Amino acid sequence: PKMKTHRGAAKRVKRTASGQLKRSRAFTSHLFANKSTKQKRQLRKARLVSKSDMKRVKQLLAYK
Amino acid sequence: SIELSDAVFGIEPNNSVLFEAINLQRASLRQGTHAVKNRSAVSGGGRKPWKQKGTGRARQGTIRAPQWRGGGIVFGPTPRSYAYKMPKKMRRLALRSALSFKVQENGLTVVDAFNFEAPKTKEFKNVLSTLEQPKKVLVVTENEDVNVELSARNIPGVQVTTAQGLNVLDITNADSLVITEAAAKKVEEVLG
Amino acid sequence: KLHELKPAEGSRKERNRVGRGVATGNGKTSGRGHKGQKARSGGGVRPGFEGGQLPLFRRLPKRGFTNINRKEYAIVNLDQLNKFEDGTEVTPALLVESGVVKNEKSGIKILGNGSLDKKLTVKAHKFSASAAEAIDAKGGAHEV
Amino acid sequence: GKQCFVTGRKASTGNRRSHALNSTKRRWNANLQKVRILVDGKPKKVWVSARALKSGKVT
RNA sequence: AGGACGACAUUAGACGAAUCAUCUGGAAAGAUGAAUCAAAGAAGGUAAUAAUCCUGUAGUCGAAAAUGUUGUCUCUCUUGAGUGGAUCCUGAGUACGACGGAGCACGUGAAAUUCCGUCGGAAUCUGGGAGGACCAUCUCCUAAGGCUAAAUACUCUCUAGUGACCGAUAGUGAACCAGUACCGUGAGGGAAAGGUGAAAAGCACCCCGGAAGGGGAGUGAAAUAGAACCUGAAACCGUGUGCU
RNA sequence: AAGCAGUAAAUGUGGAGCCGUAGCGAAAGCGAGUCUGAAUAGGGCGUUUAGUAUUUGGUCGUAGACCCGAAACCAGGUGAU
RNA sequence: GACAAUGGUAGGAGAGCGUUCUAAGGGCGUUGAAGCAUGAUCGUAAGGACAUGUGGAGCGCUUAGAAGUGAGAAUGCCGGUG
């Protein structure tokens, strides 16, 4: 049958033109009195997944 | 006389597409009706026969296991289809390459209208002898001709067909082409 | 000649057969290494998550939504408009039959990457603000 | 088993759930009552649900 | 909703072209020469390998009687639309709501549409429902009565036919008189067993022996082809011997 | 692609569609630029545009999935000779 | 023609031998097919021939195609025999 995509990965990433994935940042949910005002302001920018995780999880997003 | 066109008969043949067209037409004639029983489908089993530990014998679970004599084929045949496909331009180019090979080999031979009013194989055998054709021949026409296929269908090596029924395998298998002056322009208008 | 056939060079290869001899180097263990979970008929672990520490798409936060009325447009840059003779009032019908647009999704949008260098009368659904200037500085109009 | 005479009411089957959604099979019976209704041939006593006994019957 | 009205199909069948001679051979279909048919060069048998020896194939012909399907003729059936609007009708313990469940891709969630058990319970064309909580305006429709062919799924079974399917440890468990010897109180489980030769021509008769079994002599092209029958291998068991 | 035709042939017709020609952004939406922000100021991703159909080989996913093997668990029956 | 290089498990890459079947071409066979027995033959290996005996009718070669494709070991299954 058709291969099934990961429905919880498809809510956390998006494909860039080169085929890289644009993820989001962890540690931004609560407990903000403990993080610096600079470490809170730089966790607000999205980044790309690594080469290693792309090695691991790249069949789960073969339709994305 | 002579009726041809350099864009359906002057094609430089394409061996790499001709091989795939022949192999495709060969793979598409296979039935594929071959099956075999496995552990699920062999009658019997469902009872361990030796009680596992406490007996000097090797531990077993079924009398229909792939090792026991009498049951269980591991990965045998199964009924599957064998045909595949390829682009339309490649199909057309394969036919053009086959016909150009018959032309370059000096196989093609155009003739005027076949005229048979009653079926008879003596007449067709004599017509081939007059034209001095090889034992394997392909008689092509514009439509179905009920007195050219009733004759020349019990002769060994003579195959009769139509302009809208040309294979790559039946052309590459013959030795000579005997087309008419209608089927020639018909095939030049279909292809090319 | 059916008794003399050759595939194009580099077109076919031998498959590889494990479990048949030690000269092949895949006969015993079949390239699967020694005892482990990855050496058992059956297999290894589910792809991505392994049962071990926390997977990657269970450790990053979700994001965004999907708009139900998202409208997408079939894009047509200016340079694709050069295949049309002068005049030749261009519509989404001529633009699909000509052979530049296939799937008129929600309409067509003329974008302005390239050089027009013609005098057309483009009729589209939406224009870019850098394509209207190009289509009207070579002479020409555009109705929406 | 039993079932309403006039209409067709009869027990149905479903689940019964805990506060943790632990399912367990259970039944839902009809509110059948032994009522002596008046059909000719003889007045006979039969099962009738209390839903049909309201607003129209013979007894 | 009951009957009367000639063509096809099934269930037996008939006709059906064209080859002779020599060598090897136990035997010709093989090799060597010449020759014929073909709407027939599919296939099987025949003392070996056959388009022309047999059964057949292409083609054409056939049906007392039973059945199926089908065309026409009867046999039935059977008043179809357009205006007008006072007023009357238009499926009720139904629709729907609360509580407890289920079903919708949809896990009670903001959950629409749909069913069930218990309680409550509408309106009547200005009516009633839907357009994913809910309200208003717009658009589409008219529940609570029922029937229905085709496209679709499958094969115990009959009729033709096919296979880069097996070839007796394989293919059905079963090519054999197998679901049987048997084995179990029972439900139930389950094997293993193919082949003389072209034709039984299957050894008249003589000799040793109580018989079994031989040794001849005959049948045969072959008897280490003699029914413990094609071939006959390895482990294993022997008899003789060359060097040690 | 299914469908139609035809020797279960192989070969025509069919262009609903599907991939690519343009991205970026949660989205409205702008367009080779866009998003953030007061602001190209800088930065992130782009302008890298040659792809596409079929097919041999390697590997992965869904199916028992390289082969043999439990102690058991559920359902329906058979047993007090 | 000069120079160098060539141990190897797990495993990675390449080139090959052989088996059953299919297509097309070209062959062999009762003047004796395959199989099976022997031999003091050929190839770098997998393996290929030839001669003799037997046997008793089928079988190779070339080029491609497709796989139930090659077994000393699983207290492996079945048969035979120590």
PDB file of N, CA, C and O (backbone and C1' of nucleotides) in Angstrom, chain E residues 217-234:
ATOM      1  P     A E 217      21.914 -74.233 -23.459  1.00  0.00           P
ATOM      2  O5'   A E 217      20.519 -74.605 -24.133  1.00  0.00           O
ATOM      3  C5'   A E 217      20.144 -75.980 -24.329  1.00  0.00           C
ATOM      4  C4'   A E 217      18.683 -76.109 -24.684  1.00  0.00           C
ATOM      5  C3'   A E 217      18.139 -75.040 -25.627  1.00  0.00           C
ATOM      6  O3'   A E 217      18.002 -75.309 -27.011  1.00  0.00           O
ATOM      7  C1'   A E 217      16.642 -75.438 -23.768  1.00  0.00           C
ATOM      8  P     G E 218      17.712 -74.079 -27.984  1.00  0.00           P
ATOM      9  O5'   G E 218      16.148 -74.171 -28.200  1.00  0.00           O
ATOM     10  C5'   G E 218      15.406 -73.039 -28.604  1.00  0.00           C
ATOM     11  C4'   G E 218      14.024 -73.069 -28.014  1.00  0.00           C
ATOM     12  C3'   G E 218      13.239 -71.781 -28.130  1.00  0.00           C
ATOM     13  O3'   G E 218      12.632 -71.619 -29.395  1.00  0.00           O
ATOM     14  C1'   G E 218      13.129 -72.543 -25.921  1.00  0.00           C
ATOM     15  P     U E 219      12.564 -70.163 -30.042  1.00  0.00           P
ATOM     16  O5'   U E 219      11.661 -69.360 -29.015  1.00  0.00           O
ATOM     17  C5'   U E 219      10.270 -69.600 -28.939  1.00  0.00           C
ATOM     18  C4'   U E 219       9.539 -68.381 -28.452  1.00  0.00           C
ATOM     19  C3'   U E 219      10.044 -67.048 -28.979  1.00  0.00           C
ATOM     20  O3'   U E 219       9.510 -66.727 -30.249  1.00  0.00           O
ATOM     21  C1'   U E 219       9.809 -66.932 -26.640  1.00  0.00           C
ATOM     22  P     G E 220      10.278 -65.716 -31.228  1.00  0.00           P
ATOM     23  O5'   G E 220      10.707 -64.522 -30.284  1.00  0.00           O
ATOM     24  C5'   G E 220       9.891 -63.375 -30.160  1.00  0.00           C
ATOM     25  C4'   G E 220      10.513 -62.364 -29.239  1.00  0.00           C
ATOM     26  C3'   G E 220      11.808 -61.737 -29.695  1.00  0.00           C
ATOM     27  O3'   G E 220      11.652 -60.770 -30.716  1.00  0.00           O
ATOM     28  C1'   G E 220      11.989 -62.328 -27.431  1.00  0.00           C
ATOM     29  P     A E 221      12.398 -60.961 -32.125  1.00  0.00           P
ATOM     30  O5'   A E 221      13.512 -59.831 -32.133  1.00  0.00           O
ATOM     31  C5'   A E 221      14.815 -60.103 -32.625  1.00  0.00           C
ATOM     32  C4'   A E 221      15.853 -59.288 -31.903  1.00  0.00           C
ATOM     33  C3'   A E 221      16.082 -59.660 -30.450  1.00  0.00           C
ATOM     34  O3'   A E 221      17.022 -60.710 -30.316  1.00  0.00           O
ATOM     35  C1'   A E 221      15.753 -57.336 -30.628  1.00  0.00           C
ATOM     36  P     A E 222      17.277 -61.408 -28.898  1.00  0.00           P
ATOM     37  O5'   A E 222      18.316 -60.456 -28.167  1.00  0.00           O
ATOM     38  C5'   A E 222      18.910 -60.837 -26.937  1.00  0.00           C
ATOM     39  C4'   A E 222      18.878 -59.717 -25.927  1.00  0.00           C
ATOM     40  C3'   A E 222      18.310 -60.080 -24.567  1.00  0.00           C
ATOM     41  O3'   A E 222      19.285 -60.662 -23.719  1.00  0.00           O
ATOM     42  C1'   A E 222      17.348 -58.048 -25.331  1.00  0.00           C
ATOM     43  P     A E 223      19.172 -62.200 -23.284  1.00  0.00           P
ATOM     44  O5'   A E 223      18.141 -62.177 -22.076  1.00  0.00           O
ATOM     45  C5'   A E 223      18.171 -61.136 -21.108  1.00  0.00           C
ATOM     46  C4'   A E 223      17.640 -61.603 -19.780  1.00  0.00           C
ATOM     47  C3'   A E 223      18.069 -63.009 -19.391  1.00  0.00           C
ATOM     48  O3'   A E 223      18.272 -63.090 -17.981  1.00  0.00           O
ATOM     49  C1'   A E 223      15.709 -62.907 -19.533  1.00  0.00           C
ATOM     50  P     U E 224      19.744 -63.342 -17.399  1.00  0.00           P
ATOM     51  O5'   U E 224      20.122 -61.931 -16.764  1.00  0.00           O
ATOM     52  C5'   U E 224      19.234 -61.298 -15.829  1.00  0.00           C
ATOM     53  C4'   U E 224      19.741 -59.924 -15.469  1.00  0.00           C
ATOM     54  C3'   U E 224      20.350 -59.119 -16.613  1.00  0.00           C
ATOM     55  O3'   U E 224      19.458 -58.065 -16.964  1.00  0.00           O
ATOM     56  C1'   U E 224      21.737 -59.069 -14.628  1.00  0.00           C
ATOM     57  P     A E 225      19.360 -57.558 -18.480  1.00  0.00           P
ATOM     58  O5'   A E 225      17.792 -57.569 -18.759  1.00  0.00           O
ATOM     59  C5'   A E 225      16.932 -58.477 -18.047  1.00  0.00           C
ATOM     60  C4'   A E 225      15.553 -57.891 -17.872  1.00  0.00           C
ATOM     61  C3'   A E 225      14.525 -58.859 -17.292  1.00  0.00           C
ATOM     62  O3'   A E 225      14.205 -58.686 -15.918  1.00  0.00           O
ATOM     63  C1'   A E 225      13.699 -57.766 -19.290  1.00  0.00           C
ATOM     64  P     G E 226      14.731 -59.761 -14.852  1.00  0.00           P
ATOM     65  O5'   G E 226      13.594 -60.876 -14.844  1.00  0.00           O
ATOM     66  C5'   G E 226      12.208 -60.539 -14.671  1.00  0.00           C
ATOM     67  C4'   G E 226      11.380 -61.800 -14.591  1.00  0.00           C
ATOM     68  C3'   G E 226      11.818 -62.860 -13.582  1.00  0.00           C
ATOM     69  O3'   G E 226      10.704 -62.943 -12.709  1.00  0.00           O
ATOM     70  C1'   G E 226      11.154 -63.818 -15.701  1.00  0.00           C
ATOM     71  P     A E 227      10.781 -62.620 -11.145  1.00  0.00           P
ATOM     72  O5'   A E 227       9.376 -61.910 -10.933  1.00  0.00           O
ATOM     73  C5'   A E 227       9.269 -60.498 -10.964  1.00  0.00           C
ATOM     74  C4'   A E 227       7.860 -60.035 -11.240  1.00  0.00           C
ATOM     75  C3'   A E 227       6.765 -60.553 -10.327  1.00  0.00           C
ATOM     76  O3'   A E 227       6.738 -59.863  -9.097  1.00  0.00           O
ATOM     77  C1'   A E 227       6.011 -60.421 -12.585  1.00  0.00           C
ATOM     78  P     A E 228       6.844 -60.661  -7.715  1.00  0.00           P
ATOM     79  O5'   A E 228       8.038 -59.918  -6.966  1.00  0.00           O
ATOM     80  C5'   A E 228       8.020 -58.492  -6.760  1.00  0.00           C
ATOM     81  C4'   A E 228       9.395 -58.024  -6.347  1.00  0.00           C
ATOM     82  C3'   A E 228      10.486 -58.245  -7.396  1.00  0.00           C
ATOM     83  O3'   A E 228      10.996 -57.025  -7.935  1.00  0.00           O
ATOM     84  C1'   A E 228      11.143 -59.072  -5.214  1.00  0.00           C
ATOM     85  P     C E 229      10.018 -55.887  -8.503  1.00  0.00           P
ATOM     86  O5'   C E 229      10.937 -55.124  -9.555  1.00  0.00           O
ATOM     87  C5'   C E 229      10.419 -54.754 -10.844  1.00  0.00           C
ATOM     88  C4'   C E 229      11.045 -55.599 -11.926  1.00  0.00           C
ATOM     89  C3'   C E 229      11.248 -54.879 -13.254  1.00  0.00           C
ATOM     90  O3'   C E 229      12.608 -54.551 -13.509  1.00  0.00           O
ATOM     91  C1'   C E 229      10.104 -56.991 -13.547  1.00  0.00           C
ATOM     92  P     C E 230      13.152 -53.083 -13.163  1.00  0.00           P
ATOM     93  O5'   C E 230      13.461 -52.457 -14.593  1.00  0.00           O
ATOM     94  C5'   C E 230      12.593 -52.680 -15.719  1.00  0.00           C
ATOM     95  C4'   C E 230      13.033 -51.824 -16.878  1.00  0.00           C
ATOM     96  C3'   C E 230      14.476 -51.339 -16.774  1.00  0.00           C
ATOM     97  O3'   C E 230      15.541 -51.985 -17.460  1.00  0.00           O
ATOM     98  C1'   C E 230      12.950 -49.499 -17.146  1.00  0.00           C
ATOM     99  P     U E 231      16.820 -52.485 -16.608  1.00  0.00           P
ATOM    100  O5'   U E 231      17.627 -51.143 -16.310  1.00  0.00           O
ATOM    101  C5'   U E 231      18.047 -50.284 -17.383  1.00  0.00           C
ATOM    102  C4'   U E 231      18.583 -48.968 -16.872  1.00  0.00           C
ATOM    103  C3'   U E 231      19.655 -49.048 -15.792  1.00  0.00           C
ATOM    104  O3'   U E 231      20.976 -48.768 -16.241  1.00  0.00           O
ATOM    105  C1'   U E 231      17.952 -47.416 -15.256  1.00  0.00           C
ATOM    106  P     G E 232      22.168 -49.772 -15.871  1.00  0.00           P
ATOM    107  O5'   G E 232      22.286 -49.653 -14.287  1.00  0.00           O
ATOM    108  C5'   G E 232      22.564 -48.395 -13.644  1.00  0.00           C
ATOM    109  C4'   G E 232      22.147 -48.442 -12.192  1.00  0.00           C
ATOM    110  C3'   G E 232      22.693 -49.602 -11.370  1.00  0.00           C
ATOM    111  O3'   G E 232      23.467 -48.883 -10.424  1.00  0.00           O
ATOM    112  C1'   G E 232      20.374 -49.149 -10.889  1.00  0.00           C
ATOM    113  P     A E 233      24.745 -49.519  -9.729  1.00  0.00           P
ATOM    114  O5'   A E 233      25.737 -48.278  -9.726  1.00  0.00           O
ATOM    115  C5'   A E 233      25.269 -47.018 -10.238  1.00  0.00           C
ATOM    116  C4'   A E 233      25.463 -45.939  -9.210  1.00  0.00           C
ATOM    117  C3'   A E 233      26.103 -46.401  -7.903  1.00  0.00           C
ATOM    118  O3'   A E 233      27.487 -46.173  -7.705  1.00  0.00           O
ATOM    119  C1'   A E 233      24.161 -45.014  -7.513  1.00  0.00           C
ATOM    120  P     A E 234      28.243 -46.914  -6.497  1.00  0.00           P
ATOM    121  O5'   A E 234      27.817 -46.068  -5.229  1.00  0.00           O
ATOM    122  C5'   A E 234      28.585 -44.944  -4.845  1.00  0.00           C
ATOM    123  C4'   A E 234      28.155 -44.389  -3.514  1.00  0.00           C
ATOM    124  C3'   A E 234      28.318 -45.291  -2.315  1.00  0.00           C
ATOM    125  O3'   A E 234      29.646 -45.365  -1.846  1.00  0.00           O
ATOM    126  C1'   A E 234      26.211 -44.307  -2.240  1.00  0.00           C
TER     127        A E 234
END
